Amino acid sequence: ARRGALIVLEGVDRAGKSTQSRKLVEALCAAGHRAELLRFPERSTEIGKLLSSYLQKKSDVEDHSVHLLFSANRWEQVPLIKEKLSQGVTLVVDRYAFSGVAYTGAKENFSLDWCKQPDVGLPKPDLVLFLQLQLADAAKRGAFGHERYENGAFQERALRCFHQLMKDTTLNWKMVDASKSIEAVHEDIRVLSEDAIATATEKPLKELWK
Amino acid sequence: ARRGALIVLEGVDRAGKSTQSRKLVEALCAAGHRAELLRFPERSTEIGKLLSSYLQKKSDVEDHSVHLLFSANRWEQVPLIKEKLSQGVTLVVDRYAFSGVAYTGAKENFSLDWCKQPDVGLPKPDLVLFLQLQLADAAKRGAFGHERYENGAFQERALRCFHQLMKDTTLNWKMVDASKSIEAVHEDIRVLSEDAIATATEKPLKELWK
Ligand SMILES: Nc1ncnc2c1ncn2[C@@H]1O[C@H](COP(=O)(O)OP(=O)(O)O)[C@@H](O)[C@H]1O
Ligand SMILES: Nc1ncnc2c1ncn2[C@@H]1O[C@H](COP(=O)(O)OP(=O)(O)O)[C@@H](O)[C@H]1O
Ligand SMILES: Cc1cn([C@H]2C[C@H](N=[N+]=[N-])[C@@H](COP(=O)(O)O)O2)c(=O)[nH]c1=O
Ligand SMILES: Cc1cn([C@H]2C[C@H](N=[N+]=[N-])[C@@H](COP(=O)(O)O)O2)c(=O)[nH]c1=O
Ligand SMILES: [Mg+2]
Ligand SMILES: [Mg+2]
Ligand SMILES: [Mg+2]
Numbered sequence: 001a002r003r004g005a006l007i008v009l010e011g012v013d014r015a016g017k018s019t020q021s022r023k024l025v026e027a028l029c030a031a032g033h034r035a036e037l038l039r040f041p042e043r044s045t046e047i048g049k050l051l052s053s054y055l056q057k058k059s060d061v062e063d064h065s066v067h068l069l070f071s072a073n074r075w076e077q078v079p080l081i082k083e084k085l086s087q088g089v090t091l092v093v094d095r096y097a098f099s100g101v102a103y104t105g106a107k108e109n110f111s112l113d114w115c116k117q118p119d120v121g122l123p124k125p126d127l128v129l130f131l132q133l134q135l136a137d138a139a140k141r142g143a144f145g146h147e148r149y150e151n152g153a154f155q156e157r158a159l160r161c162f163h164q165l166m167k168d169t170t171l172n173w174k175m176v177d178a179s180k181s182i183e184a185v186h187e188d189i190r191v192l193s194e195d196a197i198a199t200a201t202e203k204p205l206k207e208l209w210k
Numbered sequence: 211a212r213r214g215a216l217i218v219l220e221g222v223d224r225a226g227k228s229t230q231s232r233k234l235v236e237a238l239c240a241a242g243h244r245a246e247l248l249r250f251p252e253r254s255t256e257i258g259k260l261l262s263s264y265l266q267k268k269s270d271v272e273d274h275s276v277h278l279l280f281s282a283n284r285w286e287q288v289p290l291i292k293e294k295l296s297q298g299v300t301l302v303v304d305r306y307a308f309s310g311v312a313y314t315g316a317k318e319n320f321s322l323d324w325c326k327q328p329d330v331g332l333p334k335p336d337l338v339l340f341l342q343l344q345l346a347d348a349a350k351r352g353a354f355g356h357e358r359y360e361n362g363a364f365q366e367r368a369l370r371c372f373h374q375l376m377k378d379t380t381l382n383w384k385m386v387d388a389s390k391s392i393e394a395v396h397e398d399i400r401v402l403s404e405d406a407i408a409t410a411t412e413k414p415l416k417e418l419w420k
Contacts, residue, residue: 002285004324032290034395046260047260047275048280050256061286062285062288062289064282064288065257065282065285065286065329066286068278068279068281068282068285068328069257069278069279069282071278072275072278072279072282073275074273074275075272075274075275075278076272076275078274079270112325114330114331117324117327117328117330118278118328120327121274121324122326137376153325161273
């Protein structure tokens with residue numbers, strides 16, 4: 001069975017990741033592919049509720065612990081992800097390990113190396129779209145929500161970390177100009193996605209950061 | 211303020227860790243030290259209940275996720291541990307990161323390196339007592355409980371991992387002959403502990419595996 005592609009959407013807050021993830025799954029299915037949507041954090045599981053509570057500022061969680069929970073929340077969906085991809089379903093994922101390193105990496109005294117480790121070995125994405133746009137334009141998209149990390153200084157430090165993670169060519173990173181219109185951004189991501197789906201069927205699923 | 215020592219007790223199942231941890235805290239306090247007992251997993255927290263449920267076989271948890279939860283369960287007590295040690299309290303801990311690597315490391319395809327990473331940076335123990343005894347003698351101590359990992363093959367593979375972790379001299383490992391009587395083993399551990407308490411007051415608390 002021809003495997004599906006693992007596609008990840010990354011980017012700062014308000015970059016359009018959730019809107020484009022949804023629209024990408026709808027377009028791929030309308031085009032005859034079997035595609036499904038996933039997101040991280042996956043807030044429906046027991047670890048997911050601890051995470052959701054933390055982000056809603058309803059609870060405080062020690063920073064290394066919260067980093068590890070974000071990773072475990074990915075490992076708990078790995079058996080499903082592998083199962084689906086091997087069945088031929090392409091998965092479109094709104095945030096993944098990159099967000100996990102970039103957001104904890106924005107906290108002082110958290111090295112990029114330490115942050116990466118828990119995620120070493122996850123399914124390696126076939127494509128990582130980075131939805132680029134000036135944090136200034138992003139701010140034009142209404143106001144900041146009330147969740148943890150939803151402020152300018154934190155976003156700025158996470159973008160810097162994302163810039164470090166892009167210097168790793170082992171991954172198929174693709175920059176997307178997220179400043180355009182929802183439909184324009186969508187057309188770009190769809191075209192990149194169709195190309196990746198075609199090629200993923202040729203090489204086995206690899207492991208991240210290893 | 212003269213800091214307290216961080217003492218860890220490690221060893222296989224039924225080696226006497228809980229009995230000796232308790233008795234060690236009682237003896238140190240009777241001898242005029244301020245000492246308190248801790249254990250891992252710490253089953254009282256939200257992560258702790260997920261862990262307890264897993265070990266009671268009431269739930270199944272994906273292996274990398276469960277490994278990370280075991281680590282987070284340590285990081286969530288780090289602010290307390292540091293606070294207490296700096297106040298002059300010696301902490302006696304029944305299991306720590308070593309058990310975290312040795313038990314996950316007993317599962318196929320989990321490298322010692324990957325297992326260590328989440329715990330990199332924890333408070334470094336001043337003393338790590340390893341309660342040594344033949345798995346055969348341990349089995350004489352009644353029967354195996356009904357928790358996960360409580361079987362011969364798994365214990366055997368964890369002991370091998372513990373043997374690897376002892377090859378790291380960066381840590382103050384001390385072997386204890388756990389085959390003796392409860393009081394005899396106790397006298398050995400107490401004497402080693404008093405010596406470590408005296409010296410911890412001279413050097414700052416270090417970080418584990420880094
Ligand atoms: N290309 C775009 N242009 C203008 N507004 C956009 C665009 N993409 C998304 N939006 C709006 O910006 C807000 C954030 O979009 P969303 O997809 O939720 O971003 P993310 O998931 O990156 O936080 C939403 O109100 C959305 O409608
Ligand atoms: N030195 C010893 N000799 C004989 N029995 C012992 C000794 N130490 C502990 N025991 C008994 O063995 C069992 C396991 O001891 P415990 O301290 O709970 O071990 P652990 O916490 O390593 O599993 C308990 O019933 C305990 O009373
Ligand atoms: C997947 C993931 C998300 N995050 C963050 C990014 C987001 N905060 N901001 N900005 C937050 C919520 O994600 P969404 O914006 O996709 O709902 O979780 C982490 O901190 N670690 C992780 O592993
Ligand atoms: C602290 C710790 C314990 N463990 C295990 C060792 C034990 N199973 N066995 N044998 C189990 C319960 O610990 P106690 O035996 O101390 O109750 O948790 C891990 O698997 N990872 C960890 O990080
Ligand atoms: Mg979103
Ligand atoms: Mg015990
Ligand atoms: Mg390394």
